[model samples]
Target: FDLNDFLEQKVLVRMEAIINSMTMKERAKPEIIKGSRKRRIAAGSGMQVQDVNRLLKQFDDMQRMMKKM
Candidate 1:
């Protein structure tokens, strides 16, 4: 019934896809998300660098939100 909720759930699903697509190498290099690494992930996962960046920012925001909660 709620479109916003549906869209939010879809976004979360896509985020899961992005996270699952990462290699062990990428996961280990969380501290260094440079342009080349971003490109490699984007290419590997069929996503854009902007999407990856946005997801990372969302993860950071969620961490802050959870800490407050």
Candidate 2:
């Protein structure tokens, strides 16, 4: 189980760290972050490729929510 809000906070912080390494193009259209681009960004942030994938999925959820309103 997650550690309540603490875990949520950590997730946000880590997401930001990962986001920090993405190039402008990837940031604007993160869906483009596949293949070599994914590996490069992951290395820049020193995070695993799967971690980047998780952040993208989370971004999808947030983007969908924003679109709903």
Candidate 3:
């Protein structure tokens, strides 16, 4: 399992934490996410940059994927 799923122990909680990590910009201007905001979020969450990268990537991917359903 991925670190987040292992940590949260459930998909719902993992998703909640992912959303909770977002700032207003991330929630709204998603495509504009950059290193500046990503670093802040990674530091705040005590996760490595790579971890946050996957989190952000997966979140974006899943949301977009869901839209096609």
Candidate 4:
């Protein structure tokens, strides 16, 4: 139940929204998403670039931890 509740939160939902808001190019190559691309995605998703950055950081951290696992 706790895990389900966690998944229901904005981080999971907004992360998907952020990815969905990105262009095909940005989605395909997330590494290429620079300042402008981030800004575009932020605007499209109706959020600030800082939120995008935070999501990306969290995703990257999760990926690394998953790799360790």
Candidate 5:
């Protein structure tokens, strides 16, 4: 296993934690999450707001990439 793969796996685990910390509604409709919600999720997941944002961005990117197929 390469370092990059391990780091990517770690990121996936963190993203799972961040997603699990979100409310049902927020998970269903992520666009509804604003600063306050992000802050709350960050606190709940023991991560920073930027980490939440990063996860959201990655989710969106992957979704869009899938649509291209």
Candidate 6:
């Protein structure tokens, strides 16, 4: 299976959900995500903290890979 395909499906889903719910202010603070904020995002997306964390990690990895491409 392709890593990009899997990351796109899993990571992008969570990213889109979070992006959809965010205000301009929140979007500007992308790097400042904390526990309470994470919990809020998890609640909004009907996911768990672990799921959010997993997506974030995958997103970071994908971002790094994309930058090199």
Per-candidate RMSD, Å: 7.6, 7.1, 6.6, 6.2, 7.1, 6.1
Most TM-score-accurate candidate: 5
lDDT of 4 by residue, 20-58 (tens): 787666654566878988898898988999988777676
lDDT of 6 by residue, 1-69 (tens): 223343335655666675455445544544576688777877787778787666667656866787578
Tell me the lDDT of candidate 3.
0.62
Flag clash pairs in model 5.
none
Query: Which RMSD does model 1 reach against the true structure?
Result: 7.6
Best by lDDT: 5
Steric clashes per prediction: 0, 0, 0, 0, 0, 0
lDDT of 2 by residue, 11-57 (tens): 56777777778776676766677878878878888899898887777
Single out the weakest 10-residue window by summed lDDT for candidate 1: 1-10
TM-score of every candidate:
0.63, 0.76, 0.63, 0.70, 0.77, 0.59
Task: Give the clash total for candidate 3.
Answer: 0
lDDT of 1: 0.63
Model 3 residue 13 lDDT score: 62
lDDT of 6 at 49: 74
Candidate 1 ranges with C-alpha deviation above 4 Å: 1-9, 67-69
Lowest summed lDDT across 10 adjacent residues in model 6 is found at: 1-10
Which regions of candidate 2 are displaced past 4 Å?
Answer: 1-9
**lDDT to native, each model:** 0.63, 0.69, 0.62, 0.67, 0.74, 0.60
lDDT of 4 at 21: 80
- For model 1, residues 1-69, the per-residue Cα lDDT tens digits are 111222244666777666666666555555476778777777776799898877767656655665577
* Residue 64 accuracy (lDDT) in model 3: 69
Winner on TM-score (2 vs 4): 2
Ranking by lDDT: 5, 2, 4, 1, 3, 6
Model 4 steric clash total: 0
Q: After TM-score superposition, what is the CA distance of residue 14 in candidate 5 from its true location, in Å?
A: 1.1
Tell me how far candidate 3 lies from the true structure as C-alpha RMSD in angstroms: 6.6
